């Protein structure tokens, strides 16, 4: 199965910058969502979950086909709460009907990271909607109750190595867990709608206590009112992961650079870009455009 990127007919960088700008203006407007967090975090999670169904062994899933629009994937228990991000993007798709679903969902995540003062994430267009029968079955996204070995095995299905895993997990500074979505509750830190290396700092510097939550699941809780999933905490239990967590806690710039590469890789897994496709786009923030 090969998925060749095909540029939306006649569209260039400026067209996609307009879609980025619409997303970013709506992010700015809808600032009350989820007790004033805004939609940035859920859009990052959306872009990851539409990408994270990929299987390197047969090229099923991944961001290319935009299959999250189909009920089987939209209703995956692993995706509970992402309907909020889908609803946010609907008026954007209405304004730009020519964009593919996979391009829109992935661009949502890129826009969110940059508008939250994160690193620039290069982004490529050309994902093409595929039919309902190409929707991956549920069960391809990761469980949170597991250990470092599980995390490493899981991410190898996505061709991600240790550094890429640790860098991607830093997105868990953003937003929060919600008991009714996932059976976990709480934020990972204080700055949860600005992109920083706080996840790593908190892992290393907080006084964590293993507790059961109100859904009877184990999570690690700090006196500051932060939480970590067992899979997050595993990054300081595994010696290889711990070394990288320390690196990113010490150097936010290095974290930014590694996250940008890993996040682009995640969103492009499964896609063959023809050698004459456009170079990756780097979108200007609203601030950079005076908008
Ligand atoms: C071992 C891998 C991972 C596991 C087990 C995991 C698990 C979870 C869980 C259980 C939630 C809470 C969902 C809810 O209650 O609303 C969550 C939220 C989140 N996840 Fe992850 N995650 C993983 C990796 C990632 C990656 C790779 C990214 C993106 C780079 C990411 C980005 C986020 C974001 C931004 C949120 C907050 C969403 C919001 O505030 O609505 N996660 N994750
Ligand atoms: C520590 N974590 C924080 C989030 N916001 C989501 C998942 C885990």
From Swiss-Prot:
Residues the record lists as binding heme b: 172
* Record-annotated membrane-spanning stretches: none
**Protein species of origin:** Saccharomyces cerevisiae (strain ATCC 204508 / S288c) (Baker's yeast)
Record gene name: CCP1
Q: Where is this site: Transition state stabilizer?
A: 45
Q: List the disulfide bonds.
A: none
Task: Select a single GO molecular function from the record's annotations and give it.
Answer: metal ion binding
Q: Which residues of the full protein are shown?
A: 71 to 361 of 361
According to its UniProt record, which cofactors does this protein need?
heme b
Q: How does it assemble?
A: Forms a one-to-one complex with cytochrome c.
The free-text cofactor remark is: Binds 1 heme b (iron(II)-protoporphyrin IX) group per subunit.
The family assignment reads: Belongs to the peroxidase family. Cytochrome c peroxidase subfamily.
**The protein's name in its UniProt record:** Cytochrome c peroxidase, mitochondrial
Record field: catalytic activity: 2 Fe(II)-[cytochrome c] + H2O2 + 2 H(+) = 2 Fe(III)-[cytochrome c] + 2 H2O
């Amino acid at each position: 199965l090969v998925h060749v990127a095909s540029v939306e007919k006649g569209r260039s960088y400026e067209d996609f910058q307009k879609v980025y700008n619409a997303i970013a203006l709506k992010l700015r407007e809808d600032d009350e969502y989820d007790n004033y967090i805004g939609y940035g975090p859920v859009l990052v999670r959306l872009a990851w979950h539409i990408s994270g169904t990929w299987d390197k062994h047969d090229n099923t899933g991944g961001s290319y086909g935009g299959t999250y629009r189909f009920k089987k994937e939209f209703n995956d228990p692993s995706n509970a709460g992402l309907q909020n991000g889908f609803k946010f993007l609907e008026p954007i798709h209405k304004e730009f009907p020519w964009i593919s679903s996979g391009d829109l969902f992935s661009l949502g995540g890129v826009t969110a990271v940059q508008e939250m003062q994160g690193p620039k994430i290069p982004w490529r267009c050309g994902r093409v909607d595929t039919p309902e029968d190409t929707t991956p079955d549920n069960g391809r996204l990761p469980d949170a109750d597991k250990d470092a070995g599980y995390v490493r095995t899981f991410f190898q299905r996505l061709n991600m190595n240790d550094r890429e895993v640790v860098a991607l997990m830093g997105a868990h500074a953003l937003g929060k867990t919600h008991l009714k979505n996932s059976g976990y509750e709480g934020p990972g830190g204080a700055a949860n709608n600005v992109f920083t290396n706080e996840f790593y700092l908190n892992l290393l510097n907080e006084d964590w206590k293993l507790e059961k939550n109100d859904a009877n699941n184990e999570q690690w809780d700090s006196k500051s009112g932060y939480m970590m999933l067992p899979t997050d905490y595993s990054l300081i239990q595994d010696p290889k992961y711990l070394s990288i967590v320390k690196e990113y806690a010490n150097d936010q710039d290095k974290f930014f650079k590694d996250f940008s590469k890993a996040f682009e890789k995640l969103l492009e897994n499964g896609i063959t870009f023809p050698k004459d496709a456009p170079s990756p786009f780097i979108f200007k923030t609203l601030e950079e455009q005076g908008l």
